[PDB]
Ligand binder design. Structure first.
Ligand SMILES: COc1c(O)cc2oc3cc4c(c(O)c3c(=O)c2c1CC=C(C)C)CCC(C)(C)O4
Ligand SMILES: [Zn+2]
Ligand SMILES: [Zn+2]
Ligand SMILES: [Zn+2]
Length: 162
């Protein structure tokens, strides 16, 4: 029982581009750019689509930095989140109806305004290290338990529908 998602972090030496959910689910929180991988699309096309729709940005390449598994108490279906980062972007960041991109200096990242798991794996991301992580949520604000480990290479899931 799982659903397939992507998350894209736009990362430059001194700054990260985040985006603010403007309405609906998760409104008021800054996040990377991502969403559900659609049927008929590959993981990486979905990551590119999320970034393009939400930030208006195109990228030359995505690095696979991480895999996050979310579990929500009472829900049997896990979220399988493929995490990517990109250094080199093309276009000017512009908001959609869903998301507004904004640059943040790395030491200014607004963790109180982001999802609670970000405080865990963001240090590994900014150190340019790959990771695998798991977070058990109760509601939106509460992590019941977590496992986070640095990895040498991101484990490939061999999704053959995506
Ligand atoms: C990657 O962005 C996140 C994230 O960091 C944490 C998230 O946590 C959630 C917890 C959650 C629920 C959630 O939908 C989330 C998240 O979606 C969530 C997300 C967003 C996931 C992506 C941008 C791929 C619904 C069930 C409930 C019991 C309310 O708990
Ligand atoms: Zn599928
Ligand atoms: Zn990167
Ligand atoms: Zn997967």
């Amino acid at each position: 029982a799982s659903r397939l998602y992507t998350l894209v972090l736009v990362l430059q030496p001194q700054r990260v581009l985040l985006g603010m959910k403007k309405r609906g689910f998760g409104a008021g929180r800054w996040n990377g750019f991502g969403g559900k991988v659609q049927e008929g699309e590959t993981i990486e096309d979905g990551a590119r689509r999320e970034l393009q729709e939400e930030s208006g940005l195109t990228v030359d390449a995505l690095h696979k930095v991480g895999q996050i598994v979310f579990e929500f108490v009472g829900e049997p279906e896990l979220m399988d989140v493929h995490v990517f980062c990109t250094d080199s972007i093309q276009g000017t960041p512009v908001e959609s109806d869903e998301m507004r991109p904004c640059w943040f200096q790395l030491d200014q990242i607004p963790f109180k305004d982001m999802w609670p798991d970000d405080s865990y794996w963001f240090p590994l991301l900014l150190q340019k290290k790959k990771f695998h992580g798991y977070f058990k949520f109760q509601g939106q604000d509460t992590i019941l338990d977590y496992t986070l480990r640095e990895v040498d290479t991101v484990l490939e899931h061999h999704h053959h529908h995506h």
